[PDB]
Amino acid sequence: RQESSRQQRKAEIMESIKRLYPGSVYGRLIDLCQPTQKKYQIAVTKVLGKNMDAIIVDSEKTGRDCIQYIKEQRGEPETFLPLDYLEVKPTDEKLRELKGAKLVIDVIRYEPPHIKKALQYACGNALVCDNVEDARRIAFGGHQRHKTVALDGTLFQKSGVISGG
Amino acid sequence: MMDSSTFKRFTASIENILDNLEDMLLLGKHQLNELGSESAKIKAMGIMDKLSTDKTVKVLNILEKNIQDGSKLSERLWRDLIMERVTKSADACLTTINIMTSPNMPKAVYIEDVIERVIQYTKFHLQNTLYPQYDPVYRQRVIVMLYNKVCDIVSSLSELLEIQLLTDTTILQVSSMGITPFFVENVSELQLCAIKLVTAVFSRYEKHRQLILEEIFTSLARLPTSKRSLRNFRLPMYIQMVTALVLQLIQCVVHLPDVVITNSYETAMRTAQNFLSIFLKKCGSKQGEEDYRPLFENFVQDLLSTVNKPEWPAAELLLSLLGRLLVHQFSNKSTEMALRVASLDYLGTVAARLRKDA
Amino acid sequence: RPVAVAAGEFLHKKLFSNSPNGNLIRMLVLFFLESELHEHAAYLVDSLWESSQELLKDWECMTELLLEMSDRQESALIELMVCTIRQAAEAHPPVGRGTGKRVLTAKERKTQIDDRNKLTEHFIITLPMLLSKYSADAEKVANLLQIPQYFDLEIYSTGRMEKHLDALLKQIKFVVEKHVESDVLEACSKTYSILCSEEYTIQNRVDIARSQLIDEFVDRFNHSVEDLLQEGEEADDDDIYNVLSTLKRLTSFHNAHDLTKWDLFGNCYRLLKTGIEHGAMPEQIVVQALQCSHYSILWQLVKITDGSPSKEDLLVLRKTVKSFLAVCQQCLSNVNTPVKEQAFMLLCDLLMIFSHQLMTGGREGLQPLVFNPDTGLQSELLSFVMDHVFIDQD
Amino acid sequence: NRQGMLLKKKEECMKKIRELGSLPQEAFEKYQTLSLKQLFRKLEQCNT
Amino acid sequence: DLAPPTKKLMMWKETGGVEKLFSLPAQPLWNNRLLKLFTRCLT
Amino acid sequence: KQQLLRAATGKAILNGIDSINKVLDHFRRKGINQHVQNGYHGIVMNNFECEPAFYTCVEVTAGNRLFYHIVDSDEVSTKILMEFNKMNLPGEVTFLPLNKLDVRDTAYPETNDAIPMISKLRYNPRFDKAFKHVFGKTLICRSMEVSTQLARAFTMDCITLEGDQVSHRGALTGGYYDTRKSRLELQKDV
C-alpha cells in the first residue's frame, strides 16, 4: 500500500540519479553482472544481502555530489564504490583444491572488466558448498574457520558471525 | 584496464631505444613483427599518451624504409628479394595499425604519403606476384604468409579510410585496387574484405559512382564462369559474388542524419534504374564475338534464390523495377527481336519461381 | 564388431518405438546409467553408428535440452555427444574394434563433408554458452575441448563469424583461469595449437591474444622468482602453492608452443641449483621446472635448423645443454622418487636427441653438441634402473 | 554570460578543425606566419 | 570378453605394443615439429 | 506522540524487541532462573549518552548495534533464544556477553584534525569491554577529504558530522540523514 508508493518514489529517484551522471553511475550490481545458473540466484543474492543495491561509481567526489542532490531529493542512503580508490585484496585462490565446494566468485559472469575488483571486495573468499551437512563440516572443522554458505542460504563467516533468512 | 602501464611501458622502451639507435639500414624482422603484434591488441588502447613529433619522425623513418620496395620490380638473390618483400609488408602492418588504432589522435599525425605508399605498394605487389603464382590465367611459405598480410592490410585500410576524409588522387588508385581482385579465382577472403572496402568507399564520397560502376562493367568478359568457385558467399544455399557486390553497394547509400528520407530513397532508386538500364541495353542484342546472357541468367537466379531474408533488403525493389522495365520494354515495336526474346524469357523464369514460392 | 552391430540393431528395434528425438536420448541415458560395466559411451555409439546414425545427428535437440535433468545425466550426455562427434569426424572406429585400418566409400566422403559443415555451424554458436554454463566442472570442459580439433577452419572466414571466435577465446581464457587440473590445460593448449595453424587467415588474432596471456603468465613468473629468491615469508606453503599452480600453467602451455623469446629457463635454473644446495624443495615444483626447462631447450633447438646458423647462439646453446645435463646429474640422486623417474625420462630423452646420429642427416652445426655420458654415470643409471624398475614381488 | 558562450563557439570551431582532415604536406612547419591577417590575405590568394 | 572399459587402458592400448612404445619418446611431444627431430635420428 | 519512536525504530526491530520482552515475561512469570532477569541490563541505547551534535554519527556508526542487549552471561542468552525458538518469534535479538568479549587493541592517532569518538560518549564502566567493542573503533574526521585520507592511512572507520563515511575496507555509504528520525534525542527529552 503506502510502502509500494514509497518504493516507486525510491526507484524513480534512483533512475533520476542514474540519468543525472550517466558516465560515472554505471548502475546496480544486478545490471552489470549475472549469475551463471538460475539455481544459484538465491544463494548469491543471500550472500550479497545489503550489497544488492550498490551503485558503481567512478570517484568518491561524484558519489558525494550525487548524495548531496539526493539530500535535496529526500532519498534513502545508498552505497557507492569508486573503482579508483576502492582498496581491495587479491583473490586468495588457494582454496581451489577443496574437494567438495567452490568459490562464490566462480558463479558470476561480469560484462565490464573494471567491476571484477569490486566483485572481489564484495565476495572475498566466501565459499559455496554442495549441501548443508558438508557446509557445516568444512565451515567448522578446520583449525581456522572458513566463510561457507550452503545452497539454502545459511551463512557462516570465518569470524564466527552467524546469519540467515 | 585503466592504463595498465607495464607493457605500455615495455613497448615505450622498445620504441625509444629503436628510434634513438636509428636516428643518431634495417631494424630487423623480429623487432618489426613484435612491434606490430604489440601494436594490435596491447596498443588497442595504449596508443594515446605519447610524444607527437616523436611519432612524426618515426613514421617518416618507416616511410623512407618502405620506399625501398616501391616499384621493386620483382637462386639466392631471389630469396633476398622475397625477404625484402616480407619485411616491407610487416612495416605496412605496423603503419596501418598505428594510423587507425586510437579512437582519437591529434590531427596531422598522419600525412597522405603513407597512404599513397601503401596503396601503390599493395597494388604492384599483389597484381604482379600473387595472381600469377595462384592462377596461370594471367601468367614458398612466405607466399601464403604475405597473402594473409595483405588481407589484414586491406581490412585495416578500409577502416581508416572510412574514418577520416582523404584526397581524390588517392581515391582513384584505392578504388582501382579494390575493384581489381574480383576477376581472378582463389581470392575469397580478399573478395569479402574488398567488399567491405568498396562499400565504405561508395558510402563516403558521392561523386565517383558513375566511374566506379562503369569500371565494374568494363571487365565482364574476364569473369570466372567456372562451376568450381562460382558461388562462394556462404549463407548449402550459396550465391554468386558480383551480384552480392552490386546489391551491397545499392543498399549502402542511405545517409540517415524530413526531406532526407525522400531524397535518399530517390537517390537509391535512380542509381538502381541507371544500373539496370545499362545492363539490359548492353546485354540484349547479340554483339560481335561475345554474349552476356549467361551472366544475366546467373544474376537473376541469384536474386530469386535470395528473395526474402532479414538482412538483404532492396531485392524486392530490384524485382519491382525489373518487372516494370521489362514489360514497358518489350511492348513496343521499335527494338529488334532477340532482345525482346531474351527479356520475355527472363520474365517467364522469374514469374515461375515467384508463383512457386507462393 | 559384427556382434556389436547386430546387438545395436536389436536395441534400436527393442526400445526406440526435434522434441520427440530427445525422449529417445533420455531413454539412452537411462540405459547408459544402468550399465555398470562401462563408464564411457564411445562403444554404444560405435555399435549404433551403422543403423541409427540419423538419430545420432540430432545435435539440435540435444542443444535445446541443455539450456532452457540430473547433473549426472547432463555430464553423461556431454560425454556421449563428444563420442558421437569423434565417430562422425573419422570413419574408422577406436582401436580394438576395427578389423580394417582403412575404410573408404564415396558416400562416406560426401557424408563426412556435410557432417563437418553441420557440426561446425552448430558448435560455433553453441560452445561459448556451454563454457559459461559449466565452467566450474573440469571434466565437462575437458570433454568439450576435443570439439575444435575437428573443425573446418575456413568456416570462421566464410561464415563472417569472428565475433563468436572472440567469445570463444574470452570464455576459454576465463576457464583456464579457474581450473588447475592438468588435463584441461593440455586440452586448451592443443586447441590453441590447432587455432594457430598458419594455413588459415585467422591465426594472427588468436596469436596476439595468446601473447597477452603470456604477458600475464610471465608477470606471475616474475613474482614467483622474486618471492623465492628473497627471504620473503620463509618458504610459506601458500606462496609455494601459488608458484606451483602458475608453473603448471606455464609448463602446459610451453609444451606446445615456442616461447623462446622469453628466457624463463634462467629463473628455473636459479631456483633448481639452490634447491639442490638445500636439498629440500617441493617435488611438484622441481618436476615441473625440469619439464619446462627441457621444453625450452627443445624449442631453442628448433630454430637453428632454419638455414642460417650463427655460431654464437650455437655455443651458448651448448652451454645451456651441458649445464642442464650437469644439474640433472646432480639431482638424479634426490630422495624424491617421482623426481627420480622424471629425471630418468628426461635424461634418456636428452641422450637420445644429442646422440652421434644427430649430425648424420647432412648437419653442419650438430657435431659440436654430441655428448657421450661418463661410464660412472652409465653405472649410476644402471644401478638406478635396477633399484626402480626390477621388482616383481611386493 | 559572455565567457561561456564564447567557449561554446570555440568548441564548435575546434569540432570543425578536427572534422575537416585537410591533409598536410612536408612544407607545413616551415611556412609559419603568426599574424592571422597576413594569414587572411594568404588564404585569399589561395582562394584565387 | 569385454572391451577396455576405461580411457587409461584405451590410450595405453593405442600407444601400446613393442613397435609403438619403441618408436615414440617416453615424454609425449604434442607438435610434430618436435617429432621430426626425434624420428630423424633413429636408424 | 510516543509512537513516533516506534515509527523511527522500524517494525523489523520492534517485533524483535517485543518478542524478547515476551520471553523475559515468560521467565518472570514462571519464577525460575531469576539470575537471567537479574543479569540482563537492557539494550545499548539505555546505557550510554552523547551530545546531540553526534546523534546521526553515533547511530549510523552502530547502525543496529544500538540494540545489542547487555547481559551478565551466556546462560541468559541461551535461555532467551531457547524460548524464542520454541515460541516461533520474529527475529532478531542481540546479546553482549561479558564473559566472552574480545576487543581489538587500538592506539588512537595523535592527529589534530580528527577526534576520538570514545572521548565524547558517556557509558557504564562495568560494560567497558562491551562499549570498547561497539564504539571504540571509528574516528570522527573534520571533512570528507580528511575522512578519506585518515581511513586510507590508518586502519579505522571514518565519518564526518554531515554523514560522509569511509570504511576501513573502502566501502562508502551516504545519503540524507534526518534529525527528527533520531531516537536518542527523545529518550533524552523524556
Side-chain angles (χ1 to χ4, degrees):
Chain A
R1 319 159 43 164
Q2 48 208 297
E3 67 295 335
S4 157
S5 70
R6 186 271 328 275
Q7 286 168 33
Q8 218 287 336
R9 303 275 80 205
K10 306 335 283 176
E12 74 91 10
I13 56 190
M14 293 300 293
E15 287 296 325
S16 316
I17 209 66
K18 160 58 176 203
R19 291 183 182 174
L20 174 73
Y21 269 129
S24 185
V25 170
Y26 292 110
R28 292 173 296 180
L29 296 188
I30 42 174
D31 312 319
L32 297 85
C33 83
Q34 191 80 257
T36 175
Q37 188 42 50
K38 304 289 112 177
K39 295 215 313 177
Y40 305 113
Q41 212 272 335
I42 311 283
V44 180
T45 194
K46 182 59 189 176
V47 66
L48 277 297
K50 59 172 308 309
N51 293 328
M52 285 202 223
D53 268 359
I55 311 306
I56 296 102
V57 72
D58 302 3
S59 158
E60 60 89 21
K61 173 165 175 38
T62 171
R64 287 188 291 103
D65 307 328
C66 294
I67 288 164
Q68 177 57 236
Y69 179 70
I70 284 167
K71 290 185 199 162
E72 313 185 307
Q73 304 308 297
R74 285 168 53 260
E76 288 150 348
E78 296 279 22
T79 68
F80 296 91
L81 267 45
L83 56 93
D84 275 340
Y85 270 73
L86 215 61
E87 196 185 290
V88 74
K89 202 171 88 148
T91 174
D92 304 1
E93 66 76 44
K94 303 153 185 160
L95 302 176
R96 293 196 168 119
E97 61 89 23
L98 197 152
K99 308 273 91 180
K102 33 193 166 180
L103 295 87
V104 303
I105 201 174
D106 287 10
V107 164
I108 295 184
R109 46 209 174 175
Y110 54 91
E111 267 182 348
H114 39 284
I115 197 54
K116 67 178 271 298
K117 70 200 268 298
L119 294 197
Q120 311 188 14
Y121 178 40
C123 76
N125 310 127
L127 202 69
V128 56
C129 177
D130 67 343
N131 49 68
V132 184
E133 286 193 341
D134 267 319
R136 179 149 179 195
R137 169 169 192 187
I138 300 104
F140 292 156
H143 274 87
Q144 85 193 320
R145 202 160 281 166
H146 307 105
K147 183 171 181 186
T148 309
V149 65
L151 197 44
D152 48 348
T154 178
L155 185 46
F156 303 82
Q157 291 186 223
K158 287 198 294 298
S159 198
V161 62
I162 50 174
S163 62
Chain B
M1 294 184 43
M2 165 195 64
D3 217 328
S4 315
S5 159
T6 191
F7 37 76
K8 215 276 189 186
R9 285 299 97 186
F10 280 162
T11 317
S13 86
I14 291 160
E15 286 270 359
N16 53 59
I17 68 176
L18 259 57
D19 67 349
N20 196 48
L21 197 144
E22 300 327 301
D23 165 86
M24 306 304 188
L25 293 89
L26 281 302
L27 265 294
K29 284 74 55 182
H30 38 284
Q31 312 285 349
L32 313 161
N33 183 20
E34 53 87 13
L35 189 54
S37 44
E38 292 304 270
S39 65
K41 202 51 173 68
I42 295 87
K43 290 196 282 188
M45 65 281 305
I47 183 57
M48 190 46 233
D49 314 319
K50 292 171 163 61
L51 201 158
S52 82
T53 80
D54 211 10
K55 309 307 158 306
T56 315
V57 190
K58 46 195 84 170
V59 307
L60 277 174
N61 196 328
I62 52 182
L63 272 150
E64 209 75 11
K65 197 174 261 307
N66 286 123
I67 296 183
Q68 205 255 323
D69 205 272
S71 295
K72 180 57 182 187
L73 54 92
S74 178
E75 205 264 330
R76 187 89 290 168
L77 196 55
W78 181 66
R79 187 268 301 165
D80 291 321
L81 313 183
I82 52 152
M83 174 44 55
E84 279 180 315
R85 298 152 155 187
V86 56
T87 48
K88 291 324 168 315
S89 47
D91 309 324
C93 311
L94 178 149
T95 68
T96 189
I97 295 183
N98 280 109
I99 298 173
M100 63 84 68
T101 317
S102 87
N104 44 2
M105 275 264 278
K107 182 66 72 51
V109 304
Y110 44 90
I111 49 184
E112 54 86 25
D113 45 21
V114 305
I115 302 292
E116 55 84 18
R117 285 309 178 200
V118 292
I119 293 298
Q120 59 84 42
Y121 168 94
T122 61
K123 183 171 175 63
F124 176 49
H125 265 286
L126 179 139
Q127 202 252 334
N128 199 28
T129 61
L130 173 47
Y131 300 150
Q133 294 205 31
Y134 263 107
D135 200 346
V137 293
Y138 273 55
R139 185 69 276 162
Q140 163 63 223
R141 291 297 93 84
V142 310
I143 300 303
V144 306
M145 183 58 140
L146 63 89
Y147 183 101
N148 303 122
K149 302 301 183 57
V150 308
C151 315
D152 311 87
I153 288 313
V154 302
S155 47
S156 55
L157 169 150
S158 75
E159 198 38 67
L160 67 86
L161 190 147
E162 185 272 352
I163 287 180
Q164 207 202 15
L165 190 145
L166 193 53
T167 65
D168 47 14
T169 76
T170 78
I171 283 289
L172 275 294
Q173 278 170 358
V174 69
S175 47
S176 281
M177 164 68 161
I179 195 61
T180 316
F182 295 119
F183 308 122
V184 308
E185 201 47 77
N186 321 113
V187 292
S188 43
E189 304 84 331
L190 277 296
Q191 288 192 352
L192 58 90
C193 53
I195 284 303
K196 196 259 178 177
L197 181 43
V198 303
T199 189
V201 170
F202 207 104
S203 78
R204 280 215 56 88
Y205 315 92
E206 59 258 51
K207 273 194 264 293
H208 300 73
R209 287 98 168 270
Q210 210 54 36
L211 181 134
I212 299 182
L213 265 290
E214 290 189 6
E215 287 177 358
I216 282 179
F217 269 127
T218 53
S219 73
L220 273 170
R222 266 196 302 188
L223 276 195
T225 52
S226 158
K227 184 250 294 179
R228 160 184 36 181
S229 188
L230 178 50
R231 319 167 174 275
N232 316 318
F233 181 54
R234 200 170 174 76
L235 170 58
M237 287 149 186
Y238 302 93
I239 70 169
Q240 208 180 20
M241 197 57 67
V242 311
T243 314
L245 169 148
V246 57
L247 54 83
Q248 283 273 14
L249 296 193
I250 189 52
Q251 58 81 25
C252 165
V253 188
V254 73
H255 178 65
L256 190 44
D258 289 329
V259 70
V260 294
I261 312 303
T262 59
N263 59 50
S264 44
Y265 193 95
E266 298 301 331
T267 290
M269 270 186 50
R270 173 198 324 273
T271 48
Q273 178 74 245
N274 172 36
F275 161 65
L276 297 163
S277 159
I278 288 186
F279 204 105
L280 264 63
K281 165 183 303 181
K282 184 166 298 189
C283 173
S285 158
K286 173 58 183 99
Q287 287 201 149
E289 273 95 353
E290 54 86 17
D291 54 342
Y292 280 174
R293 302 182 304 266
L295 274 300
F296 193 73
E297 162 73 13
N298 293 323
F299 189 103
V300 298
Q301 287 282 149
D302 182 330
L303 268 59
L304 59 91
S305 71
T306 65
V307 167
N308 277 322
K309 296 293 166 57
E311 58 261 1
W312 273 282
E316 55 283 357
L317 166 60
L318 272 186
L319 265 295
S320 52
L321 203 45
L322 176 82
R324 201 188 309 169
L325 163 63
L326 286 178
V327 61
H328 270 305
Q329 178 60 255
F330 76 89
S331 164
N332 76 331
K333 59 175 174 293
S334 68
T335 82
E336 45 278 31
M337 273 291 103
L339 196 152
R340 269 157 70 103
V341 189
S343 46
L344 194 52
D345 180 280
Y346 308 143
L347 190 61
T349 288
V350 306
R353 172 64 64 105
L354 197 147
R355 185 65 199 275
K356 188 260 285 183
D357 271 334
Chain C
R1 193 170 196 270
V3 167
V5 171
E9 316 184 289
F10 182 84
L11 176 61
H12 180 75
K13 309 182 59 214
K14 182 64 170 88
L15 295 184
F16 291 71
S17 53
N18 46 296
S19 197
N21 289 337
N23 313 338
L24 295 190
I25 289 149
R26 294 181 183 174
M27 286 165 215
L28 171 143
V29 162
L30 158 72
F31 165 100
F32 182 46
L33 286 171
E34 289 308 302
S35 172
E36 200 64 52
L37 278 175
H38 268 92
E39 285 172 4
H40 63 90
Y43 288 97
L44 285 195
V45 57
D46 169 55
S47 302
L48 294 178
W49 193 250
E50 187 44 49
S51 163
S52 162
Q53 186 176 352
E54 74 301 330
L55 169 61
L56 298 178
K57 291 190 183 186
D58 309 343
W59 301 297
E60 296 142 29
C61 82
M62 281 187 288
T63 297
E64 180 170 352
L65 276 75
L66 293 164
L67 294 177
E68 39 184 4
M69 292 298 295
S70 169
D71 275 328
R72 195 183 166 182
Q73 298 168 346
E74 292 151 77
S75 51
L77 181 167
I78 291 169
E79 300 166 30
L80 58 90
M81 185 167 318
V82 176
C83 295
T84 60
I85 296 319
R86 189 140 182 278
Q87 265 303 115
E90 174 91 30
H92 84 84
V95 75
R97 181 66 70 189
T99 68
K101 294 150 296 306
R102 190 268 311 159
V103 295
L104 285 182
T105 88
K107 319 303 297 307
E108 267 171 359
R109 294 154 219 166
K110 172 159 202 303
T111 290
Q112 208 272 3
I113 292 158
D114 258 352
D115 293 18
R116 166 91 40 97
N117 310 321
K118 279 159 178 292
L119 289 172
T120 45
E121 62 89 3
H122 202 72
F123 287 107
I124 295 307
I125 295 172
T126 65
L127 292 196
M129 296 306 296
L130 274 291
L131 283 298
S132 63
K133 182 151 170 44
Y134 293 110
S135 292
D137 263 357
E139 63 281 349
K140 298 180 178 60
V141 309
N143 272 326
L144 196 154
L145 282 181
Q146 316 294 341
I147 297 166
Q149 322 195 348
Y150 305 113
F151 295 169
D152 177 302
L153 297 166
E154 289 185 15
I155 309 314
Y156 268 128
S157 52
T158 60
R160 300 186 158 171
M161 299 288 179
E162 304 89 343
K163 305 230 183 65
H164 304 93
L165 172 145
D166 292 322
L168 176 146
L169 58 86
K170 185 175 181 179
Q171 295 326 287
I172 200 171
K173 178 173 184 199
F174 192 79
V175 174
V176 174
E177 300 197 287
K178 264 182 44 183
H179 270 278
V180 298
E181 187 176 286
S182 302
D183 67 335
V184 171
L185 302 62
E186 170 171 330
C188 76
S189 57
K190 273 163 181 287
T191 55
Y192 293 116
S193 71
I194 291 300
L195 292 173
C196 203
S197 314
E198 207 175 7
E199 194 175 354
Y200 294 90
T201 67
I202 48 175
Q203 182 271 338
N204 316 86
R205 183 184 299 267
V206 308
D207 198 33
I208 297 167
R210 170 165 71 183
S211 85
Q212 188 265 356
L213 268 62
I214 198 63
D215 202 344
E216 304 178 356
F217 305 159
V218 68
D219 80 28
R220 298 171 296 170
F221 205 71
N222 288 0
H223 175 62
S224 75
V225 56
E226 70 86 35
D227 185 63
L228 284 286
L229 288 193
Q230 69 183 319
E231 273 66 26
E233 295 83 18
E234 304 328 292
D236 277 356
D237 64 299
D238 289 345
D239 303 317
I240 274 169
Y241 179 78
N242 287 330
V243 180
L244 177 54
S245 43
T246 56
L247 173 55
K248 286 209 217 289
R249 308 187 180 107
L250 269 295
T251 51
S252 59
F253 276 90
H254 209 189
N255 199 345
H257 306 280
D258 192 295
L259 308 190
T260 55
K261 321 203 303 179
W262 306 264
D263 44 357
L264 315 102
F265 181 94
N267 294 313
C268 308
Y269 179 65
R270 286 171 183 173
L271 64 92
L272 280 170
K273 98 179 193 168
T274 197
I276 297 173
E277 294 295 332
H278 286 81
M281 267 301 116
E283 307 93 346
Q284 296 297 327
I285 287 172
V286 292
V287 61
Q288 284 304 70
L290 277 184
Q291 278 308 100
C292 69
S293 43
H294 182 57
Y295 298 149
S296 71
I297 289 171
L298 291 193
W299 276 117
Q300 273 152 12
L301 174 59
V302 178
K303 51 183 194 321
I304 316 286
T305 53
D306 55 2
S308 199
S310 53
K311 221 181 294 164
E312 302 83 336
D313 60 342
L314 182 55
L315 291 52
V316 295
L317 272 151
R318 191 177 67 213
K319 179 193 292 181
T320 49
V321 300
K322 181 179 178 180
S323 43
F324 189 57
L325 292 160
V327 304
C328 171
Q329 181 179 313
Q330 186 64 52
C331 67
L332 80 89
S333 302
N334 186 290
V335 294
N336 316 301
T337 36
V339 177
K340 294 171 179 182
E341 72 95 358
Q342 179 60 87
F344 180 75
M345 296 189 294
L346 191 167
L347 207 41
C348 297
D349 283 17
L350 297 172
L351 183 47
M352 271 292 140
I353 291 317
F354 287 78
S355 43
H356 161 61
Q357 304 302 323
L358 187 58
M359 197 267 263
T360 66
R363 304 288 186 243
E364 300 178 351
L366 295 195
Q367 193 171 8
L369 284 282
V370 61
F371 184 81
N372 291 305
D374 168 49
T375 51
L377 179 149
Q378 289 190 51
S379 311
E380 182 61 34
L381 300 185
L382 186 60
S383 86
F384 179 91
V385 303
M386 289 301 295
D387 297 353
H388 292 273
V389 183
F390 292 111
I391 294 300
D392 51 347
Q393 290 307 296
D394 295 333
Chain D
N1 304 260
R2 285 82 82 198
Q3 297 60 238
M5 198 47 232
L6 291 153
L7 294 207
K8 300 310 288 282
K9 299 283 288 179
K10 283 314 285 208
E11 198 276 303
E12 301 322 296
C13 309
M14 59 83 75
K15 188 200 42 192
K16 296 331 271 178
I17 76 194
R18 307 156 320 106
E19 281 311 312
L20 316 184
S22 174
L23 264 301
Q25 324 84 33
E26 295 176 350
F28 155 62
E29 64 89 16
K30 299 98 174 180
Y31 209 104
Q32 178 46 43
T33 298
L34 311 93
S35 77
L36 200 69
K37 271 67 58 187
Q38 188 187 8
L39 273 301
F40 278 167
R41 63 98 165 178
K42 291 303 300 181
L43 181 53
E44 290 165 293
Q45 293 136 12
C46 279
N47 273 101
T48 318
Chain E
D1 265 8
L2 294 95
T6 64
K7 298 154 182 289
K8 193 193 276 306
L9 288 171
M10 289 298 294
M11 66 194 73
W12 287 2
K13 183 179 172 70
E14 287 288 15
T15 178
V18 59
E19 68 293 339
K20 323 283 279 203
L21 269 172
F22 276 29
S23 50
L24 317 163
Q27 184 68 32
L29 302 175
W30 301 341
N31 200 324
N32 47 345
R33 283 189 67 197
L34 286 294
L35 280 289
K36 322 306 182 88
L37 64 100
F38 186 89
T39 195
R40 198 165 50 181
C41 82
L42 185 59
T43 306
Chain F
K1 280 88 85 176
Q2 296 180 68
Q3 208 184 38
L4 291 286
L5 276 172
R6 316 177 70 263
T9 299
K11 309 320 149 166
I13 292 291
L14 284 170
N15 59 54
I17 299 170
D18 292 5
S19 290
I20 210 175
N21 283 161
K22 292 158 195 155
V23 180
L24 279 72
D25 199 7
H26 172 68
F27 298 145
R28 222 185 296 179
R29 193 57 79 211
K30 174 68 212 65
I32 311 188
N33 207 359
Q34 294 187 52
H35 321 109
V36 173
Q37 172 72 309
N38 206 4
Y40 178 87
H41 299 148
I43 61 179
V44 162
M45 202 184 59
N46 199 5
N47 274 303
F48 79 102
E49 308 198 302
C50 169
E51 288 309 319
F54 308 114
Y55 283 168
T56 290
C57 170
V58 301
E59 176 141 346
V60 323
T61 275
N64 292 342
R65 303 209 192 241
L66 293 184
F67 300 94
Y68 292 5
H69 305 97
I70 298 95
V71 306
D72 269 350
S73 75
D74 214 338
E75 282 286 355
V76 175
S77 300
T78 181
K79 195 52 73 69
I80 298 174
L81 259 182
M82 172 175 289
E83 303 298 304
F84 187 97
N85 167 12
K86 157 201 195 69
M87 288 168 216
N88 196 216
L89 291 180
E92 196 262 7
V93 304
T94 42
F95 298 107
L96 284 156
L98 295 174
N99 86 323
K100 268 308 288 187
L101 286 169
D102 209 324
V103 176
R104 175 152 303 291
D105 180 72
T106 45
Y108 301 87
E110 295 80 61
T111 320
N112 193 14
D113 49 61
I115 52 177
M117 173 176 279
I118 199 170
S119 158
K120 308 292 155 178
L121 302 166
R122 192 228 39 88
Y123 57 81
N124 192 355
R126 180 159 46 122
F127 303 160
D128 279 332
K129 285 176 167 197
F131 282 93
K132 286 190 175 179
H133 178 83
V134 288
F135 309 112
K137 206 192 201 173
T138 189
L139 211 51
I140 309 197
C141 288
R142 156 169 309 194
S143 314
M144 303 154 285
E145 73 95 358
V146 175
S147 173
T148 47
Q149 182 180 11
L150 206 155
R152 299 292 160 165
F154 309 97
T155 312
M156 305 260 291
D157 180 1
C158 296
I159 181 177
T160 62
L161 211 47
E162 312 84 3
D164 286 291
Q165 295 186 295
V166 53
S167 80
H168 66 124
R169 316 171 70 207
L172 302 183
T173 301
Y176 182 76
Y177 290 98
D178 209 20
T179 317
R180 294 303 93 175
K181 295 180 180 178
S182 197
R183 295 183 296 273
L184 293 172
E185 182 69 66
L186 308 85
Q187 165 58 33
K188 293 325 191 294
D189 299 91
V190 182

